[PDB]
Amino acid sequence: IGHLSTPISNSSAVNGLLANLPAYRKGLTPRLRGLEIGMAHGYFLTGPFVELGPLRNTDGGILYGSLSAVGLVVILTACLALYGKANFSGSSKSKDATLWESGEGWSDFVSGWLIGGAGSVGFAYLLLQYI
Amino acid sequence: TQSVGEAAEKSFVMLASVLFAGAVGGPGIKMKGQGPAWPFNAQIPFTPSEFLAVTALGHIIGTGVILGI
Amino acid sequence: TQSVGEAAEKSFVMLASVLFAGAVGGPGIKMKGQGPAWPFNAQIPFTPSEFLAVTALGHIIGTGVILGI
Amino acid sequence: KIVIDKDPVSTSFDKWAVPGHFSRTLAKGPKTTTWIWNLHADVHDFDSYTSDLEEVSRKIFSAHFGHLAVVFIWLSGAYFHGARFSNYEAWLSNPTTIKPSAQVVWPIVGQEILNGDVGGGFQGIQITSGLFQMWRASGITTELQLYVTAIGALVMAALMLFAGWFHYHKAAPKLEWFQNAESMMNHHLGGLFGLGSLSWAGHQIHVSLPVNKLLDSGVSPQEIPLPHEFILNKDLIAQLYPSFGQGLTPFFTLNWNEYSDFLTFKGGLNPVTGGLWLSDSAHHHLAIAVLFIVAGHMYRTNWGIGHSMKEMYDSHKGPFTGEGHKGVYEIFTNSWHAQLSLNLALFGSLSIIVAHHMYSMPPYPYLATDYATSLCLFTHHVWIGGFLIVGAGAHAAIFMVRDYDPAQNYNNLVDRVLRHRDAIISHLNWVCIFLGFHSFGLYIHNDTMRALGRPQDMFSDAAIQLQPVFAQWVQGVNSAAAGNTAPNALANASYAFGGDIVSVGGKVAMMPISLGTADFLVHHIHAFTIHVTVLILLKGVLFARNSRLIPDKANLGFRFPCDGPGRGGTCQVSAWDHVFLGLFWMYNSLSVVLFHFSWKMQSDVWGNVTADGAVSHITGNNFAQGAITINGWLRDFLWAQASQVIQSYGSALSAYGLMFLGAHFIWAFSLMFLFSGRGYWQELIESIVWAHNKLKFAPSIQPRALSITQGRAVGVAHYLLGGIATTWSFFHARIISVG
Amino acid sequence: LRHRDAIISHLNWVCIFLGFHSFGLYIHNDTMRALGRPQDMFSDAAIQLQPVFAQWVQGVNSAAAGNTAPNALANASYAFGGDIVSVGGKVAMMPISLGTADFLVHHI
Ligand code: CLA
Ligand code: CLA
Ligand code: CLA
Ligand SMILES: CC1=C(/C=C/C(C)=C/C=C/C(C)=C/C=C/C=C(C)/C=C/C=C(C)/C=C/C2=C(C)CCCC2(C)C)C(C)(C)CCC1
Ligand SMILES: CC1=C(/C=C/C(C)=C/C=C/C(C)=C/C=C/C=C(C)/C=C/C=C(C)/C=C/C2=C(C)CCCC2(C)C)C(C)(C)CCC1
Ligand SMILES: CC1=C(C/C=C(\C)CCC[C@H](C)CCC[C@H](C)CCCC(C)C)C(=O)c2ccccc2C1=O
DSSP states (O other): OOSOOOSSTTOHHHHHHHTTSTTTOSSOOTTTHHHHHHHHHHHHHHHHHHHSSSOOSSSOHHHHHHHHHHHHHHHHHHHHHHHHHHHOSSOOOOSSOOSSSSOSSHHHHHHHHHHHHHHHHHHHHHHHHOO | OOSSOTTTTHHHHHHHHHHHHHHHTGGGOSSOOOSOOOTTOOOOSSOHHHHHHHHHHHHHHHHHHHTTO | OOSSOTTTTHHHHHHHHHHHHHHHTGGGOSSOOOSOOOTTOOOOSSOHHHHHHHHHHHHHHHHHHHTTO | OOOEEEOOSOOOTHHHHSOOOSOSSSSSOOSBTHHHHHHHHSSSOTTTTOOOHHHHHHHHHHHHHHHHHHHHHHHHHHHHHHHHSOOHHHHHHOTTTSOOEEOOOOSSTTGGGGSEEOSSSOEEEEOOSOHHHHHHHHTOOSHHHHHHHHHHHHHHHHHHHHHHHIIIIIEEEOHHHHSOHHHHHHHIIIIIIIIHHHHHHHHIIIIIHHHHHHHTTTOOSSSSOOHHHHHHOTTTTTTSSTTTTTTTSTTTTTOGGGGTTTSOOOOSOBTTTTBOOHHHHHHHHHHHHHHHHHHTTOBOOTTSOSBOSHHHHTTOOOTTTTTTTTTHHHHTTTOHHHHHHHHHHHHHHHHHHHHHHHHSSOOSTTTSSOHHHHTHHHHHHHHHHHHHHHHHHHHHHHIIIIIOOTTTOSSSHHHHHHTSHHHHHHHHHHHHHHHIIIIIHHHHHHHHHHTTTOTTSSBSSSSBOOOOTTHHHHHHHHSSOBTTTBTTOSSOSOSSSSSOOEEETTEEEEOOOOOOHHHHHHHHHHHHHHHHHHHHHHHHHHTSSOOSSOTTTTTSOSSOOEEETOTTOEESOSHHHHHHHHHHHHHHHHHHHHHHHHHHHHHTTOEEEOSSOOEEESSOSOHHHHTTSHHHIIIIIIIHHSGGGTSOTTSTTHHHHHHHHHHHHHHHHHHHHHSSOSTTHHHHHHHHTHHHHTTTOOOSSBOOOOOHHHHHHHHHHHHHHHHHHHHHHHHHHHHHHTO | OTTHHHHHHHHHHHHHHHIIIIIHHHHHHHHHHHTTOTTSSSSSSSSOOOOHHHHHHHHHHHTOBTTTBTTOSSOSOTTTSSOOEEETTEEEEOOOOOOHHHHHHHOO
16 A cells, blocks of 8 residues: 554544544535634634733733734734745646645635634633633 | 633643543543434534543543642 | 622623513514524524624613613 | 333232242141241242242342341431430540440349449440440430431331332332443442442531530530531631631632641541541541542443443453453343352451451540440451351352353353362362461460470570561551651551550550561461361352262252262262351351450550550550460460459349350250251150150141251351350450450 | 654654754743843743752652661662762762753753
8 A cells, every 4th residue: 555554543533533623624615614723723822922921920911912922823824825825826726626735715714714813812812811 | 820810720720631531531432422412413523421521531630630730 | 689799790681681682683583594504503593693693782782771770 | 221010019918827928849838847947948048939030139129128127227226225225425424434334224133233333323234336436426415316316217217118118019120120230330339339428528527527626625515516506607617627718619619728627637546535537537538439439430321431341351351261251240140149249258358357447547536445345346347247258158159059150151260260170179278288287286386395394495586486577567668658658647547557655544545566476376377267268168169069079069959968878978068068167167267366356455455554654454465475375375365364254243244244154055055956967856756756646646747857957057056156155245244344 | 664754753853842942942041141131031030941850750769768768778879869978078979959950951
């Protein structure tokens, strides 16, 4: 074959997380499955900035710290679109036509990522500075 | 806990423990899928019967870690 | 308000207002059922598009009652 | 799942009058007197005549409620006779000096001299049941509180007796309701042991802790509050151990370290009472609860999760063992008998474990110094322990006789044990003869070296030393354990491994029990006689069906007397007679275990403490050289301590002198049945029925002898009737006076 | 040999992960001292990286003479714990302590 047959390759309980994440999933539209990614990566990214920052013990640490978290995401949706210009030159048609093989929804992935990538970010700033 | 509460940072230890449980207690359940199903028939990739155990297992592991540190 | 908080009893006024809205703002919506549907495909007798408006209408009526009393 | 049929048994009195309705041997009429005994012998073994596994399991289920009733009737008599006729408030005033007494005796011939002076303004029989030290820990301060209980033990006796009625006469369950083992194991672990200790953990803090904070401050049984005030007046309960100011919120924000005054890990003995710290026993039964309720969710029911036991035996199989435990889950879901023996074995062996864990760790206030009770509380459960264990050897053989199936058992673990059963027995045979010479024969060497005037050539301390180098090291790690491995404890689990002598007044609560050269011997006696008691019961079970002698032993049943004078003579071959043989050896086993207790506890543990703390024991340390010989077991122990019960006529301790005499009688009365046989006596009734046929009234019930198993059964049941009751009074009279 | 990429590529990752999170913790520590921000470096009076496993192991081996090694008079060494020892005027051995600077080098 091509791959190897261990006793734990292609095991069910890890495939249940694999084929149900919002990037390998079945029916989600590429505007929406980029939201669940952007809601995911955004909420924790304001973790490291607010307890490990240049100023941590001020008014002032969660507020400024969380500007850099949305300030990181805007460099990521940039890096998503430069991947869109360079991998999808016209979204050249390929073997699967996923969101990922052939593009077709990439700036709907990109715009979907930025919604939670600002939305989930300040939600933790709500949950950290208040509550 | 430099940006949060002292009894607020236990909730990260307790809620990680539910995810620490079900990540390796979840694939150990042999007979899965036995009833009842979800309240609003939300087709979701586990059962409430199973998920109640993970929150129960997470509540025991989290008690072990919180009192352990 | 005899056994609760002063900023806790506003939450009964706000959450009643969402039920006060959707009980008589709900049957006034003419075109219902337009997308999107619920997140986990929970077959539930309204839409999240409609229900977000009721929580928005309830947030306005509740602001009117709380500041009104 | 709940599965019940309606009204299977009608509440009609027609089967009350005519006896023997349940058998097809019975309901005919006694043409002989064997029918009178054949009725009373085969009453309750419902598997003998009900050939229906559903029907028998309902008769077992309801009769357990009836046995739940007669405890609650008897628990009423322990609670009503203590509220009404006790010196309990006199015992609560001065706990140390005043001995307990309940059962005031009536004013007739001189049995009212048993109402002797006990202390206070009360006269009665000195009780050795420990209920006074038990109820004091529970917090019972006035007779009135107990008064309702006996009522609550009576009404729950009525409720269980109705539940035995309702769950058999009206609504008796299905067979498949009984085979639901995993839902039964989940509930008994979670609900019975878990919540039942959780609720006792609640009663220990809400009721039993706070008054023992006050009684041990030395104030009164009068100015202390009542239990209902402790819940309500939350600042009365916040003055003693001031941690109830925070309430149930530290239990829920997991800052459990803020319970550091009423939930403890002291681990010693309460020095003002000599018993267990109740704040330790509260944190105990809390941790037992949470362990048991968590263990209550281990087994699989109809929610998918849980361990299935049938799936756990398959894939427990080895190269030595073949099929593993396959079929063994089906054994304890079809056979009640195998379920009885396994449950009995770990009920009796538990009953000896509690007896060992009570003297080294006194659980109760002023039970430690009350040597009248703390010796009797040992010796009761040791006998109850040894009795259920021979029951475990009994009903193992009954499962083997009929409920054994070779179809379900092919090359699994039940079959292969029967397929090397000689190698099991003959190796266990050798170790009895090894441990008879090298444990009992050492006492014989200790006689023939001491009587010959050579006390340097025996096995003692001042001679060849048989030192217990292992058990002296186990004390070396169970006493260095605290703070060296168990760092949060104050002291060790008990003081017996080492530490200071703890005393309440001048009586020792507990002191470090040394092990010397004599303790190696007597422990190896116990290793000897238990290994014989195992051997007779294991030979009865492994050869229950067949042997080289009789291949149809279980075809002849569980309880058949003999196979006659054939094969050279074959008597006492059955699985019943091995239990009959194993009852005396169990009597011979535990009697040494009780003797090893009642001397070492008197000689090396208990005694009178002077003001500086210099202990003087009761017999004054004479186990270390007396107990190595047979003579010193007779001279220094049995002759010395039998004095207290033969100089007791005209005392309040006088029925002890009577039962010591009265049980020497019935023991010898066994030997009329044991050493003899049937066919002498049934021949002798030919002469005695002649005296009633000469005068023309020889009865229609033909006056019969006993059967051979019965003559064995009466002979052992009167044998144990004597030797335990001989010791029962002998232990009572001796430790009351000098202890 | 039939999975030799999974060995090497996971070994490749844990090499790079270790170089960033050990040596890069010095380049972080170089800069915060160069920029005069000693509240931002990784030190003992700073963001501490405490070696708790090597202090629990150093603890349980120094409290073993008498608990789990009873017949030993003193411990296995004086490098885990205990008093110092001198010969002449110089120290034979003393407990080598492991703080944030010892965590930082043990990962290198
Ligand atoms: C030469 C250009 C340059 C400039 C002006 C800065 C400036 C900064 N860097 Mg530095 N950095 C640079 C190059 C630069 N960097 C390079 C080339 C490297 C690699 C060697 C680094 C490696 C580095 C690290 C590891 C860190 C910094 C940090 C910082 C900040 C310290 C003060 C602060 O956080 O206020 C507190 C204020 C905030 C945290 C919020 C300020 C505004 C944020 C940045 C943007 C908010 C979103 C905005 C609306 C949109 C995104 C902006 C983006 C499009 C430009 C300061 C903003 C520290 C930091 O805090 O990161 C954020 C920090 O940890 N830098
Ligand atoms: C006190 C009287 C007494 C004695 C001494 C014995 C002895 C024995 N019983 Mg018996 N038993 C007794 C009463 C007694 N029983 C009674 C009353 C009953 C009725 C309930 C039984 C029912 C019973 C059963 C059911 C069993 C035994 C078994 C045994 C043997 C156990 C193994 C052993 O210890 O070998 C070593 C022997 C001794 C300790 C005997 C004393 C030997 C001395 C100390 C050494 C000899 C000195 C010297 C060398 C002799 C030679 C010199 C001389 C010839 C000149 C042992 C021979 C068991 C058995 O046979 O297992 C293999 C067994 O299963 N007995
Ligand atoms: C000091 C000089 C030096 C440095 C920095 C390196 C670095 C490296 N060597 Mg090399 N090597 C060297 C000398 C050096 N080597 C020499 C002299 C030889 C000849 C014998 C080799 C032969 C050799 C072999 C045979 C191998 C390596 C490998 C490696 C890599 C190891 C994994 C790692 O730590 O990644 C993390 C990277 C670092 C720790 C480098 C420093 C990065 C800093 C701390 C962070 C960057 C700061 C900032 C973000 C930078 C950008 C700022 C800007 C964008 C504004 C690493 C890149 C191995 C490898 O590739 O494994 C995967 C490997 O197998 N090297
Ligand atoms: C411990 C552990 C673990 C875990 C970890 C992880 C995985 C984590 C993650 C987690 C996460 C990561 C989480 C998430 C969350 C999120 C959230 C919860 C958020 C929210 C959001 C929101 C809220 C949004 C929305 C919005 C928008 C979009 C806009 C508009 C507005 C709003 C804001 C509404 C594991 C399993 C590995 C293993 C074992 C151990
Ligand atoms: C069973 C159980 C449970 C559960 C339960 C729960 C938790 C519940 C909750 C509860 C809830 C959560 C409920 C709620 C409900 C509500 C209600 C009851 C409401 C009503 C109201 C009304 C209806 C009113 C309204 C209105 C207005 C205001 C105006 C306009 C009109 C109307 C009428 C609409 C638990 C877990 C504990 C445990 C176990 C047992
Ligand atoms: C003495 C003896 C008998 C004879 C003893 C018998 C049959 C028991 C007779 C005594 C009982 C106690 C008589 C029962 C008394 C009546 C029931 C009295 C009724 C009066 C009412 C008021 C209750 C045996 O049958 C026997 C069998 C096998 C081995 C040894 C022996 C053995 O040693």
